[PDB]
């Protein structure tokens, strides 16, 4: 019941803080992706 409920409803100071987080996470993912492609070859 709990799943069906969540499925129907959900699944079916300087303003600078959010910019740092985004750039950090995106850059990290980019690193790892390129390393993986190189390793496969």
């Amino acid at each position: 019941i709990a799943f069906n409920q969540i499925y129907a409803n959900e699944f079916q100071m300087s303003p600078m803080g959010p910019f740092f987080q985004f750039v950090h996470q995106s850059l990290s993912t980019c690193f790892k992706e390129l390393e993986s492609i190189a390793q496969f070859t």
Binding site: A2, F3, I6, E10, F11
Partner: protein, 55 residues
């Protein structure tokens, strides 16, 4: 007298065999296990609802 005793025993055993799938501890135990595995899985899914939604 001996025939009557054995006949009863046979009748009893037959009744037990016919109702074992729903009554015997062995078969009932297997059904429990299958149900517990699914419960745990659903609990996990509910715990990660936000991440799953974002994805």
């Amino acid at each position: 007298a001996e025939i009557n005793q054995k006949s009863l025993e046979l009748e009893l055993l037959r009744l037990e065999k016919e109702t074992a799938d729903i009554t015997h501890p062995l078969y009932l135990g297997q059904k429990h296990q299958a149900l517990q595995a699914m419960n745990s899985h659903l609990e996990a899914v509910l715990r990660e609802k936000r991440s799953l939604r974002q994805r």
